[PDB]
């Protein structure tokens, strides 16, 4: 393919589930499934802010079948901000607000 002009991705239609995205643990792995399967043929990928306390890691791997298996690990708790972008965009709901009891 020479030229697309074609494949317009949205991120409103990007769609997450799990915890880690509504709360997190102290020391428990949180992980999130994202779904692009209608939203486009862009690249997926992360920013994990730091406003309070950095993150021990960030695992990202493309499952597949339009699913990208995403999870992290904390040490500190108190209120988080994960940003997770959808090639150039911000997926319908963030930043989402992680509490971390």
């Known amino acids: 393919g020479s030229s697309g002009s074609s494949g317009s991705s949205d991120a409103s239609k990007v769609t997450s589930k799990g915890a880690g995205l509504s709360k997190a643990f102290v020391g428990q ?18 920013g ?3 406003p309070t306390t950095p993150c021990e890691e960030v695992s990202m791997k493309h499952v597949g079948n339009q699913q990208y298996n995403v999870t992290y690990v904390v040490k500190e708790r108190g209120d988080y901000v994960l940003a997770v972008k959808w090639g150039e965009e911000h997926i319908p709901g963030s930043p989402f607000h992680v509490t971390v009891p």
Not at 30 to 42: E, I, T
């Open 29 to 46: 792995k949180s992980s999130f499934l994202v779904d692009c399967s209608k939203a486009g043929s862009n690249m997926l990928l992360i």
């Open 48 to 50: 994990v802010h730091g």
